Amino acid sequence: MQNEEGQNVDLYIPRKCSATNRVITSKDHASVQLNVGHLDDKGLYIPGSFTTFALCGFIRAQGDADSALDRLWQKKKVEARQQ
Amino acid sequence: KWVPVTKLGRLVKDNKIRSLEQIYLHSLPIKEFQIIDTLIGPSLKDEVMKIMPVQKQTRAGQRTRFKAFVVVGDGNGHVGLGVKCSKEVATAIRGAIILAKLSVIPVRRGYWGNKIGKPHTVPCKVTGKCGSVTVRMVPAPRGAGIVAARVPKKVLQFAGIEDVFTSSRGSTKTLGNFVKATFDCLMKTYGFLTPDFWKETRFTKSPFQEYADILSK
Amino acid sequence: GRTLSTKEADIQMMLAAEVHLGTKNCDFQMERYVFKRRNDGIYIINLGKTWEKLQMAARVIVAIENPKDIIVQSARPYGQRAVLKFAQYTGANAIAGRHTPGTFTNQLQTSYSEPRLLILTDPRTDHQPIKEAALGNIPTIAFCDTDSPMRYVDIGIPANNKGKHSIGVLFWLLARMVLQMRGSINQGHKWDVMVDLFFYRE
Amino acid sequence: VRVSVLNDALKSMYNAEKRGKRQVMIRPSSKVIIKFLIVMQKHGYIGEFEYVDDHRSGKIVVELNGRLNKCGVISPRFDVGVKEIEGWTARLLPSRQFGYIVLTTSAGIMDHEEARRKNVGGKVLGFFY
Amino acid sequence: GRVRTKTVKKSSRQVIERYYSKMTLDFHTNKKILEEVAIIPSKRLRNKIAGFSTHLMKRIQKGPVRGISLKLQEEERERRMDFVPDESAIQTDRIEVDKETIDLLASLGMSELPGVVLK
Numbered sequence: 001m002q003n004e005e006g007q008n009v010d011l012y013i014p015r016k017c018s019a020t021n022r023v024i025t026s027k028d029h030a031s032v033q034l035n036v037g038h039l040d041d042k043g044l045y046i047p048g049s050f051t052t053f054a055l056c057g058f059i060r061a062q063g064d065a066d067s068a069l070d071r072l073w074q075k076k077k078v079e080a081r082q083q
Numbered sequence: 084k085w086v087p088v089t090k091l092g093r094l095v096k097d098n099k100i101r102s103l104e105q106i107y108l109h110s111l112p113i114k115e116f117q118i119i120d121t122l123i124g125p126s127l128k129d130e131v132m133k134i135m136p137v138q139k140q141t142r143a144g145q146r147t148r149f150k151a152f153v154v155v156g157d158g159n160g161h162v163g164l165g166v167k168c169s170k171e172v173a174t175a176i177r178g179a180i181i182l183a184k185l186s187v188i189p190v191r192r193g194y195w196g197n198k199i200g201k202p203h204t205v206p207c208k209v210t211g212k213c214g215s216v217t218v219r220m221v222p223a224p225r226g227a228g229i230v231a232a233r234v235p236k237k238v239l240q241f242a243g244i245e246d247v248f249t250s251s252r253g254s255t256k257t258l259g260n261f262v263k264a265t266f267d268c269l270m271k272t273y274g275f276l277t278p279d280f281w282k283e284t285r286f287t288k289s290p291f292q293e294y295a296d297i298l299s300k
Numbered sequence: 301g302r303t304l305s306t307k308e309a310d311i312q313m314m315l316a317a318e319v320h321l322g323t324k325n326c327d328f329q330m331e332r333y334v335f336k337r338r339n340d341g342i343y344i345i346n347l348g349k350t351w352e353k354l355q356m357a358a359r360v361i362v363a364i365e366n367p368k369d370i371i372v373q374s375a376r377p378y379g380q381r382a383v384l385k386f387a388q389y390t391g392a393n394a395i396a397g398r399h400t401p402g403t404f405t406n407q408l409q410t411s412y413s414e415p416r417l418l419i420l421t422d423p424r425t426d427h428q429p430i431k432e433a434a435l436g437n438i439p440t441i442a443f444c445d446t447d448s449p450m451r452y453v454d455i456g457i458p459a460n461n462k463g464k465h466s467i468g469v470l471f472w473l474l475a476r477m478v479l480q481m482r483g484s485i486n487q488g489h490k491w492d493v494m495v496d497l498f499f500y501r502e
Numbered sequence: 503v504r505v506s507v508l509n510d511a512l513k514s515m516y517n518a519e520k521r522g523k524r525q526v527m528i529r530p531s532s533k534v535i536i537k538f539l540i541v542m543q544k545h546g547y548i549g550e551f552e553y554v555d556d557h558r559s560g561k562i563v564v565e566l567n568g569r570l571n572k573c574g575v576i577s578p579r580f581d582v583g584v585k586e587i588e589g590w591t592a593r594l595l596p597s598r599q600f601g602y603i604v605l606t607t608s609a610g611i612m613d614h615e616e617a618r619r620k621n622v623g624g625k626v627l628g629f630f631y
Numbered sequence: 632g633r634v635r636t637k638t639v640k641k642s643s644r645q646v647i648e649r650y651y652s653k654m655t656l657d658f659h660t661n662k663k664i665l666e667e668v669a670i671i672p673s674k675r676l677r678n679k680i681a682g683f684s685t686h687l688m689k690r691i692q693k694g695p696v697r698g699i700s701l702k703l704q705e706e707e708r709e710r711r712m713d714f715v716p717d718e719s720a721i722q723t724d725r726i727e728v729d730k731e732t733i734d735l736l737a738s739l740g741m742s743e744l745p746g747v748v749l750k
């Protein structure tokens with residue numbers, strides 16, 4: 001949200017679930033954030049280089065978080081050449 | 084003085100975390116009221132809303148305990164609610180203040196029509212429910228004021244909302260449920276997905292990962 | 301000759317350890333990792349997906365700057381030694397046996413912990429740790445069988461988490477991958493640590 | 503019996519979006535449903551939708567972006583003049599900054615802002631946001 | 632009845648944990664050791680703690696006792712458990728796998744894995 005002039009007005013921009021797109025609230029303590037590190041040509045982890053995924057409490061309680069994260073990681077690895 | 088027992092408390096005492104929005108972004112639990120006191124304590128104001136006695140029947144009479152409801156707020160988008168039952172009214176009030184400080188939440192404020200100046204009302208229609216009490220908040224034009232009963236009006240004033248319309252259904256004479264429904268309605272402000280939030284999220288390191296080396300000791 | 305690849309040798313060892321033998325029931329959320337059901341009724345797990353999930357879990361683990369923020373625990377007796385050795389070699393913490401309720405929520409408890417990641421041998425027997433972690437924004441990696449519940453499981457590795465040999469092999473495999481990604485040991489299927497060290501023993 | 507295929511389709515999409523499904527099935531298909539879906543897609547509340555022919559009413563498979571808070575039908579289709587659009591929007595939409603009311607007018611199926619722009623009235627079909 | 636209280640039990644456990652080296656199986660020697668290495672307000676309490684400590688020592692001589700952590704017992708257990716056999720108990724030379732596992736490996740492309748044999 002922005003003013004007519006163009007100034008940011010919101011207190012903060014909440015994160016969104018990487019799978020459901022739901023807004024992650026401040027008291028959604030079931031939500032999680034995961035970093036999947038990247039590997040070089042020799043199968044060595046490169047420090048500071050990872051893909052970040054956020055999962056909401058709704059999906060994690062529903063139990064679809066595992067499959068959703070698997071699909072998202074597969075797509076992101078295909079895009080980023082992580083094999 | 085204060086000896087933090089959590090990573091978040093340690094970071095707040097070490098000044099690595101300077102704003103409540105950093106915690107709100109990652110939704111980390113807050114288990115020490117000293118964090119809130121250090122971050123937004125100076126601008127916080129507390130108010131006792133009701134002292135409710137409750138009684139438990141026993142073999143040798145009725146055991147009476149008192150319930151204290153406390154509302155804390157900065158009037159600038161931060162509000163919290165606390166309920167504490169205790170034998171003594173003073174102890175109940177102290178516990179309620181601590182709980183409200185711990186339960187402070189961020190409140191999203193938007194515009195009714197033209198977006199000039201600071202926000203004055205709720206971004207969209209919201210509804211909170213506690214027990215049988217349902218409280219609905221509707222955006223209002225500038226100058227409309229806070230159209231609400233005394234309890235929701237106090238909660239909204241502490242939250243910092245300038246003008247809004249409200250409707251209520253159910254046993255609103257149940258003050259605890261009324262205030263809890265108002266708090267839920269205010270909390271639901273940031274959970275609604277609007278077009279301005281359609282932009283893809285750019286994640287940032289959580290505090291525990293950013294200051295992992297500092298917390299490693 | 302024809303030296304096997306790392307994945308080939310790894311899947312061979314999984315077959316030797318019987319990691320691909322599931323139970324007679326399959327969870328609807330674990331069905332995607334199951335290959336097919338045999339005439340007897342035991343579901344066969346897909347060792348390729350198991351290896352890929354092991355790789356993913358190792359990738360997630362290696363990204364943790366401080367290994368002491370990772371807690372791995374096993375409720376059942378068989379996996380206690382496996383989790384102990386995994387913690388010893390990867391540098392993480394291990395909790396062997398019963399899990400104290402409130403460990404992740406009671407800030408005043410003496411055993412209070414704030415892990416950045418949780419690792420579990422079986423969700424069914426480690427339900428309480430998973431439920432508690434659901435209250436503290438703690439990511440979860442779990443070794444899930446065909447009938448394991450997937451609730452509050454972030455990364456589920458499809459494997460037989462009931463046999464001592466299977467559990468030991470799985471934890472040895474995860475430790476080897478994490479160490480290789482870190483770069484402290486040589487790449488390939490071989491690792492100086494004896495696999496039997498992770499096996500439950502009378 | 504089946505009375506409002508548009509209502510059935512919108513309810514199916516709303517339930518699927520709540521459940522978090524990436525794709526939803528609509529059966530039977532209709533040109534009113536297609537126009538409603540096109541209106542939503544124009545503003546970006548849904549992804550691509552594909553029509554499947556079966557020598558019958560047909561079927562539709564719609565991809566869901568995750569941006570749809572709620573889509574619903576208004577029954578009966580009340581007559582809405584150009585001056586009643588403000589009241590209908592106040593009644594149905596969460597806010598004045600976003601949200602759409604779909605109307606069928608003599609100029610075609612369109613959202614309430616386009617109806618206001620063209621100064622055309624009609625009958626309310628539904629809403630989405 | 633004669634049931635030792637929490638005070639006696641805790642005192643005996645702590646005394647055994649902290650001074651296992653000098654502990655004996657004789658009640659009089661144990662009570663003398665307790666008098667030397669602890670402050671007990673009551674002689675009756677001292678005798679009760681000494682007797683319970685002797686009983687706990689007798690059990691420990693048999694084997695491990697829950698609630699008591701002995702450095703030597705733990706170190707000996709770790710030393711014994713840390714051993715490994717000459718040959719690992721995982722035979723990759725011969726692996727009997729069912730036709731379903733054969734199909735799984737064929738789908739994976741690992742239809743040539745050495746040692747894999749159908750029943």
Ligand SMILES: [Mg+2]
Pocket residue numbers: none
């Ligand atoms: Mg018709």
